[PDB]
Design a protein around this ligand. Structure first.
Ligand SMILES: NC(=O)c1ccc[n+]([C@@H]2O[C@H](COP(=O)([O-])OP(=O)(O)OC[C@H]3O[C@@H](n4cnc5c(N)ncnc54)[C@H](OP(=O)(O)O)[C@@H]3O)[C@@H](O)[C@H]2O)c1
Ligand SMILES: NC(=O)c1ccc[n+]([C@@H]2O[C@H](COP(=O)([O-])OP(=O)(O)OC[C@H]3O[C@@H](n4cnc5c(N)ncnc54)[C@H](OP(=O)(O)O)[C@@H]3O)[C@@H](O)[C@H]2O)c1
Ligand SMILES: NC(=O)c1ccc[n+]([C@@H]2O[C@H](COP(=O)([O-])OP(=O)(O)OC[C@H]3O[C@@H](n4cnc5c(N)ncnc54)[C@H](OP(=O)(O)O)[C@@H]3O)[C@@H](O)[C@H]2O)c1
Ligand SMILES: NC(=O)c1ccc[n+]([C@@H]2O[C@H](COP(=O)([O-])OP(=O)(O)OC[C@H]3O[C@@H](n4cnc5c(N)ncnc54)[C@H](OP(=O)(O)O)[C@@H]3O)[C@@H](O)[C@H]2O)c1
Lengths: 246, 245, 245, 245
């Protein structure tokens, strides 16, 4: 009777922000939910405790997205714990600020490893477990397709990479019945992008309706895509950005 | 109810995707008006089913090709329901034919029904919609990807709605009305039956080769115009089985 | 000559981007016809300059809003030149105004001139074009990205041409005719003067803040229709100073 | 000479599209450096041909997967030529294989060569480029449309360059340097031979079913970086025979 009755999900980067909202919403819709995190162990356990209080199974796994072995092992741990896997949400991500002149190799490698390679590795590992009706969603960005200012180029490249990955992976997994999609948030009130931050006025100015998005609304859209009326949504990008990309 | 008290107009709501949209908005709590061209009995059956849920519903005969009829239909719904919160521009036609055989009548009918009617209804709705109002149009996966011959006029008509949607989101931003487009792929309807002559070729283009359900297209429209869709704006949402991957 | 022996028609060739395209195709070797609506003096000056190069050239008054005039103009050029190799759909209008003030006349004029004329001329030209023929239309960076209010009808009309272009490339593929769209950004013309009141705002959207030259737009069109453009097909080429980045 | 006095670096210039670009920039008047990984004989033959035109040319073994080597290659060219005007990021790999079989070595090699090397070279070149400088990268029609299984890592690596290109155009706007991406479709090279096993399937996706010529891709790159390309910026130019229509 739950929209996600019996479903088994992993949300990377689920301790805070958009990922925590997604984890809570999938649980609210009926799924058992695992999350990964890098450092926020207390906050991750609190997400888990809240999901368990609903009567769901939940686990939090410390797994550095930059480490492909940790990512692959986290996916396998979820499938072992829950008996299988139905939903993967690749959400953990970083935004390294800086000018072109100042860009470091460490920032390039960190961004490509966390924002791109971890998505590829988790997707491949999840595909070993997912069956017909399984769902993969990744968190992109409105910046993947429209870059309004300087200082965003490395991040934009990392999110644009996920568009090609998503469309190709939908072809790879089509015969097995697994959909692959990307949700592109615009400005969304989180620790990465606080609505009271110094740059928030400029970000609101780009929107058609000038209001930061809610993480819970991004989560609602992810939950629709991975839910019982989302089966024909596949290989595509869904932008929730207040009209910034109009 | 997710759409408690909302007042909606779905053009071309007598059959197909539009009937599914009208039924879903009503199931979610909205009062729903539909237009139709000729299917008076089917339209009234849609209306009767919505009334049976306890909602208000009306069906207005209004030829999308006639811009006066379209504008009047929008105003008549606002009069009948007291206001208007949601406009879904869904009525559309697909005139089959080769480039060689393309007629002026087909060009005019397609542009008038699939484009001009959307512009006219959107403008009229903008005189009524308040803060939090929602406009959605039905596009097509063919608006951005055209796989074969014989689709060019139709693809042009749907691509036009992309520019309209993005610009209109800018126009209506200060008033707080979102404007979006939902692009179906192959969806089992009278226009595109899943047992039709072209249906194998259409399925072959998808990642998961099954025609879509009109009810799922309706579910996505209902999400966009609902209480968690306020930040979805100026954008296209494709539900096509992966055809455009 | 890059376009030695080629036979071209550029709609709206009396001034602006169209005149620049006409002059460049002629400079590259082509015989060139142009259409215009009212600017007989400026059209004749374009023709006289092309004739001074030694090419054939004609100017046809042909209202793009009249489908019969458009078809007949295409047929007249093919008859006069003995054939047709290149069609450039460039004539267009930009009706300024708010959504509230948008008139049915504005809607019809924009769809008729900016969309229907392109479809009609393309179909007419396809009766004359052969293997190696080329169709290009003038789009706009606004077709895919609309930054402000007041542009929605125009953006819709240019976005329509993307779907048309991609579908027509499929239609004409077996016959070896490419179909492409060039999307200018802010380009210094009577429609969009670089020293105008709103030109500062348009420059601010660009990466390099300088209006484009009509002659550079013409250079890109000339590349697409020339001897190294055969594999450019079904696509949009944007020349907008980075506005759409 | 359209590129009189210009000083260019083409990564992966020993074979294929890169060799064609290097040769075309030299034919247009530029001094040209190339990088290569292992084809020393081929690289020296490209250099010798350019020198026979009267231009300066150098070949540098520089593994794109090594960011220090990439940065050093850019600095070496700028030192040898006295400056730098044009950077073409062309070196790339396509690791064939299924999702099931994808290795971490494949993932790392593809991201290092196809993405990180472009970022590193672009940043290094920006220390030498001045007003009027040009950066172009070789993308792929697969960056935006993926028709089959087995392409997903590669498609991701080329899609990455679209976001890089648009963002870097913003970064380098105040300095007057344009940044663009040219997306070839099926182009007859060692990576994608026109008589290879998958070549029939690739031709079947096109509107005009013939593999592209590397020299035509080079001609389009040469246009973008030349004297009429100043307003082409932050954009993708696809040369794919209509595959992406
Ligand atoms: N907020 C926006 O406006 C916005 C807009 C567009 C896209 N996005 C994308 O949305 C996603 C979530 O962003 P957010 O705003 O919610 O960010 P956030 O507040 O910074 O939260 C980031 C989340 O990712 C986790 N994470 C980061 N690096 C990780 C690593 N190496 N290993 C494991 N987990 C890691 C964090 O774990 P810890 O708690 O342990 O640090 C946390 O759970 C990201 O992909 C971001 O790029 C955000
Ligand atoms: N089915 C697909 O695979 C597909 C895919 C992409 C996009 N679409 C789009 O989805 C929309 C609905 O398509 P559908 O498949 O549901 O089509 P359908 O089965 O042919 O239903 C068409 C609906 O539009 C109405 N309509 C058509 N022309 C009209 C006019 N001149 N005035 C008033 N109403 C008019 C019809 O009214 P009557 O009942 O009175 O005739 C009917 O309610 C269209 O915009 C279509 O282009 C469909
Ligand atoms: N300028 C820009 O910034 C810009 C940017 C993007 C796209 N565009 C597009 O580029 C194209 C050319 O624009 P432009 O800036 O060169 O404009 P322009 O200076 O206004 O010239 C318009 C041309 O189109 C002709 N024309 C207009 N309506 C016509 C009709 N009904 N019948 C026949 N010819 C007609 C005009 O003929 P008359 O001389 O007889 O009036 C003239 O030759 C248009 O499609 C426009 O939308 C322009
Ligand atoms: N061919 C097509 O159909 C097609 C279509 C779309 C995009 N592309 C792209 O076009 C570009 C050129 O492709 P192509 O078809 O000409 O390929 P190719 O025949 O395989 O030539 C590849 C070139 O890149 C160089 N290269 C590769 N890896 C390198 C590395 N680690 N360090 C330095 N140089 C390296 C090669 O050097 P060595 O000679 O030393 O090996 C060679 O010069 C690539 O980015 C490719 O992805 C090709």
């Amino acid at each position: 009777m739950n929209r996600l009755q019996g479903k088994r999900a992993l949300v990377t980067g689920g301790s805070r922000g958009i990922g925590a909202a997604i984890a809570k919403r999938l649980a609210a819709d009926g799924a058992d939910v695992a999350i990964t995190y890098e450092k926020s162990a207390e906050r991750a356990q609190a997400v888990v405790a809240g999901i368990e209080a609903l009567g769901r199974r939940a686990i939090a796994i410390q797994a550095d997205s930059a480490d492909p072995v940790a990512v692959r092992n986290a996916v396998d741990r979820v499938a072992e714990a829950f008996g299988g896997l139905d939903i993967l949400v690749n959400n953990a991500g970083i935004f390294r600020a800086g000018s072109l002149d100042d860009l470091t190799l460490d920032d390039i490698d960190a961004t490509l490893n966390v924002n791109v390679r971890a998505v590829i590795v988790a997707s491949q590992a999840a595909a070993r477990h997912l069956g017909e009706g399984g769902r993969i969603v990744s968190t992109g960005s409105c910046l993947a397709t429209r870059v309004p200012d300087a200082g965003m180029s490395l991040y934009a490249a990392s999110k644009a990479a996920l568009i090609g990955w998503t469309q190709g992976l939908a072809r790879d997994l089509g015969p097995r019945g697994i959909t692959v999609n990307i949700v592109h948030p615009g400005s969304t009130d989180t620790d990465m992008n606080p609505a009271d931050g110094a740059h928030a006025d400029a970000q609101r100015s780009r929107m058609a309706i000038q209001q930061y998005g809610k993480a819970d609304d991004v989560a609602a859209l992810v939950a629709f895509v991975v839910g019982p009326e989302g089966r024909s949504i596949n290989g595509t990008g869904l932008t929730i950005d207040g009209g910034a990309n109009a």
